[PDB]
């Protein structure tokens, strides 16, 4: 028999929870949207954003579908842990960011089907659900049951995907119940693909992959396959791009360093080797430059080339880098 310790990841909470009061949280399409700030003034930025996106993209024809969406998002929020970074605020940020990036690219926006838009919003909303605030490597290091259940790369990503569908399966949350089987399968496949590609281990491969697509002329949005890849890239960019929304906003998202430090200490307490660079850096600013240069900047450079209308992120990142470099020295 396999002797495994209890998982550090919590099981899915299927309970029906009352959605929070949503009010007009101001353009939802703006990249300068400060999710943390909105969260400080409204009961739930995640629920307010999800409602607005659903309306902005005319998701529902019936009130019944609208109500299931509301309860689903409330339940999804109930399944995000109180982590410094991988929490419901990050979820709202990625959802709003995906909405913003997609809305800014005319070719893609004009060719996306209603089903594809619903899948994109649902995926962004649930992309980190149940995240324990520890990495896939950490789960593997402690021999967590989740690492044995979901094999191969993207352990947590597979878990988020499975959790999302488990919740969507609850009758009171199933807003896709009216879709026929072929449509629901398409929905599921898009969602799986999108959440699956948020796995940081695929970054370099995706950048080279899309770089080649760019050289070949970019995406052909009349092609379903290209729209899916485009959505995947934009979701990924939204996931790792809060630092590109402006200097003030970027600073707020440095809370990711708290989770890394927490993990470094968790590793130390467990007697495991400490992950390089996870302990709080002496110079937050200096430590960020490599991240911007290796991950974020190249990503938004690629995005701008593939979608010329998405330019702001790149300029904000360069402004941020100069500030970090100037303060570091």
- 301 marked among binding-site residues: no
Least distance in angstroms from the C-beta of 90 to Zn ion = 6
Query: What gap in Å lies between CA 103 and CA 31, rounded to an integer?
Result: 10
CA–CA separation, 79 vs 314, rounded Å?
33
In the bound complex, what is the minimum distance in angstroms from residue 125's beta carbon to Zn ion? Answer: 11
Q: How far is the CB of 2 from Zn ion (least distance, A)?
A: 30
27 annotated binding-site participant? no
Question: Has 288 been labeled as part of a binding site?
Answer: yes
Looking at beta carbons only, is 118 or 131 nearer to Mg ion? 131
What is the phi/psi pair of residue 319, to 5°?
-65, -40
Whether the Cβ atoms of residue 123 and residue 190 lie closer than 8 Å to each other: yes
Count helices and strands (H / E) in the chain: 17, 0
236 annotated active-site: no
| DSSP conformation class of 223 | S
Site for Zn ion in 200-259 (CB under 5 A): 239
Does the annotation place 144 within a ligand binding site? Answer: no
Q: Which is nearer to Zn ion, 77 or 239 (CB)?
A: 239
> Is 239 assigned a ligand-binding role in the annotation?
yes
Considering only residues 126 to 185 of the shown chain, the ones binding Zn ion according to CB under 5 A are 128
Burial of 205 (0-12, 13-18, 19+ CB in 10 A): exposed
Q: Which does 259 bind (CB under 5 to 8 A by kind): Zn ion, Mg ion, none?
A: none
**Least distance from Mg ion to the Cβ atom of residue 313, Å:** 19
Q: Which of 52, 86, 160, 236 is catalytic?
A: 86
User: Which chain residues interact with Mg ion by CB under 5 A?
Assistant: 128, 198
Q: How many CA atoms lie within 13 A of 78 on its CB side?
A: 18
Contact indicator for 259, 220 with CB cutoff of 8 Å: no
Whether the Cβ atoms of residue 266 and residue 98 lie closer than 8 Å to each other: no
Residues serving a catalytic function are: 86
- The binding site for AMP comprises 86-90, 128, 239, 288
- The binding site comprises 86-90, 127-128, 157, 239, 288
Positions touching Zn ion (CB under 5 A) are 128, 239
């Amino acid at each position: 028999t396999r002797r495994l310790p209890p998982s550090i990841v919590q099981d899915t909470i299927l309970a029906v929870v009352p959605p929070k009061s949503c009010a007009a949280i101001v353009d939802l399409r703006d990249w300068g949207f400060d999710t943390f700030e909105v969260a400080s003034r409204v009961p739930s930025v995640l629920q307010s954003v999800a409602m607005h996106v659903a309306l902005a993209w005319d998701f529902f024809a019936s009130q019944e579908e609208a109500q299931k969406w509301a309860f689903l998002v409330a339940a999804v929020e109930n399944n995000y842990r109180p982590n410094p970074y991988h929490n419901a605020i990050h979820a709202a940020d990625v959802l709003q960011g995906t909405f913003s990036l997609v809305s800014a690219a005319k070719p893609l926006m004009e060719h996306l089907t209603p089903l594809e838009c619903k899948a994109a919003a649902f995926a962004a909303l649930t992309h980190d659900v149940c995240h324990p605030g520890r990495t896939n490597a950490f789960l593997a290091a402690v021999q967590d049951p989740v690492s044995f259940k979901f094999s191969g790369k993207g352990t947590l990503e597979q878990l988020h995907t499975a959790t999302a569908f488990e919740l969507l399966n609850v009758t009171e949350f199933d807003f896709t119940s009216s879709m026929d089987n072929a449509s629901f399968l398409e929905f599921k496949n898009i969602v799986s693909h999108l959440i699956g590609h948020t796995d940081m281990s695929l970054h370099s491969e995706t950048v080279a992959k899309h770089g080649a697509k760019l050289s070949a002329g970019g995406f052909d949005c009349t092609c379903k396959e290209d729209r899916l890849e485009a959505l995947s890239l934009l979701l990924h960019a939204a996931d790792i791009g809060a630092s590109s929304r402006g200097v003030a906003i970027a600073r707020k998202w440095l809370v990711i360093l708290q989770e890394f430090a927490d993990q470094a200490e968790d590793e130390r307490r467990r007697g495991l080797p400490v992950t390089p660079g996870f302990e709080t850096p002496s110079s937050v600013e200096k430590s960020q430059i490599p991240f911007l240069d290796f991950f974020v900047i190249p990503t938004f450079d690629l995005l701008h080339q593939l979608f010329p209308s998405i330019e702001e992120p790149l300029h904000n990142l360069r402004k941020l880098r100069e500030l970090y470099a100037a303060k570091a020295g």
